[PDB]
Design a protein around this ligand. Structure first.
Ligand SMILES: [Cl-]
Ligand SMILES: [Mg+2]
Ligand SMILES: [Mg+2]
Length: 225
């Protein structure tokens, strides 16, 4: 009965203006001297830092040495520059989150490639951060496939619920979302509101596939059942 529902942010709940890419580039120039070189849909913020820097010849150990400062600089710069007008809430998202959060049998959480501080700043601008009491984030791993385990442990410690696979729902817009759900044999719901079409997403065998979340009642039925 009790259901755990985990949402990706970018291309699932909202989108951000191209300034996001430039905030990162600026933070890396500040810390390492280079923005690297330089799609990152569904990827972990930490893995993106390693990739773009390693592309220009930096060793992993060299990247690691200043990684935390690069992270902090990126977060601070994002919080400084981003405005509400940079964020676009996707179709039906607020309606869906209201429908879920009003149910006692539902626990909502985030499972995202964003660092928590910047991912939650994105959610705060349009005023949907308040729906998400916990999550797993890029602070927790470089590999998205470690996150479901971490989120499951956190949810269980919060509620005392021992969610079974059919009680866990992982929602996102890329193959990486679908793939990380397999870690828990969870129910994956993919939504084709990012850079990948239904035809593309369908090859990864999501449990369910939506075009978008316009029909709140049907998305809810699909999530709870
Ligand atoms: Cl909020
Ligand atoms: Mg996404
Ligand atoms: Mg080398």
């Amino acid at each position: 009965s009790r259901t755990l529902v985990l949402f990706d942010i970018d291309g699932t709940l909202l989108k951000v203006e191209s300034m996001n890419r430039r905030v990162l580039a600026d933070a890396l120039i500040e810390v390492y001297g280079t923005e690297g070189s330089t799609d990152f849909s569904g990827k972990m913020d930490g893995a993106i830092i390693y990739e773009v820097l390693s592309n220009v010849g930096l060793e992993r150990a060299e990247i690691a040495d200043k990684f935390d400062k690069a992270k902090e600089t990126y977060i601070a710069l994002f919080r400084e520059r981003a405005r509400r007008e940079d964020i676009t809430l996707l179709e039906g998202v607020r309606e869906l989150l209201d429908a879920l959060s009003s149910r006692s049998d539902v626990l909502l959480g985030l499972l995202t490639g964003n660092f928590e501080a910047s991912g939650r700043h994105k959610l705060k601008l349009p005023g949907i951060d308040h729906y998400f009491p916990f999550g797993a984030f890029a602070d927790d791993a470089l590999d998205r496939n470690e996150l479901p385990h971490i989120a499951l442990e956190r949810a269980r410690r919060m509620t005392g619920a021992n969610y079974s696979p059919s009680q866990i729902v992982i929602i996102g817009d890329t193959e990486h979302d679908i793939r990380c759900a397999r870690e828990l044999d969870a129910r994956s719901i993919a939504v084709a509101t990012g850079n990948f079409t239904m035809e593309e997403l369908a090859r990864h065998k999501p449990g369910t596939l939506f075009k978008n979340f316009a029909e709140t009642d049907e998305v809810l039925a699909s999530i709870l059942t």
